[PDB]
Amino acid sequence: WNRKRISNCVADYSVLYNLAPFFTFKCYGVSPTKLNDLCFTNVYADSFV
């Protein structure tokens, strides 16, 4: 459960939408198509295989 912390960032999601290796965008509680308009306090990432 190695969790990566995102605090000081400009979260540009054009990487997430304009690159080839992406399959599913299963978002709960928020729409993925409007993620570039909001702001967040702290973002946490769990990146496993």
Place this chain on the structure above:
Amino acid sequence: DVVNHNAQALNTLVKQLSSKFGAISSVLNDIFSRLDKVEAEVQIDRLIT
């Protein structure tokens, strides 16, 4: 009592706007910002009702 009932009903009507009525948020703009038009309308129909 005539003064107090008319004050109390208005206070209840004001305080009822913080209720969610089963929606995700009682704030009107947050549902519009966090969701697209497919489910924002069905989430805000509960608030309007």
Place this chain on the structure above:
Amino acid sequence: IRGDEVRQIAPGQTGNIADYNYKLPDDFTGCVIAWNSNKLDSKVSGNYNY
């Protein structure tokens, strides 16, 4: 369209094709149809027409 991006065709979506190429309205009534085309569009050493 490249297969991993075929989910980009929906009312209210963003991305390369969904923004710069083909925008669907939010009140869209219709159907979206997609099928694999390895027999025709995929050519030897790359099909550069698309």
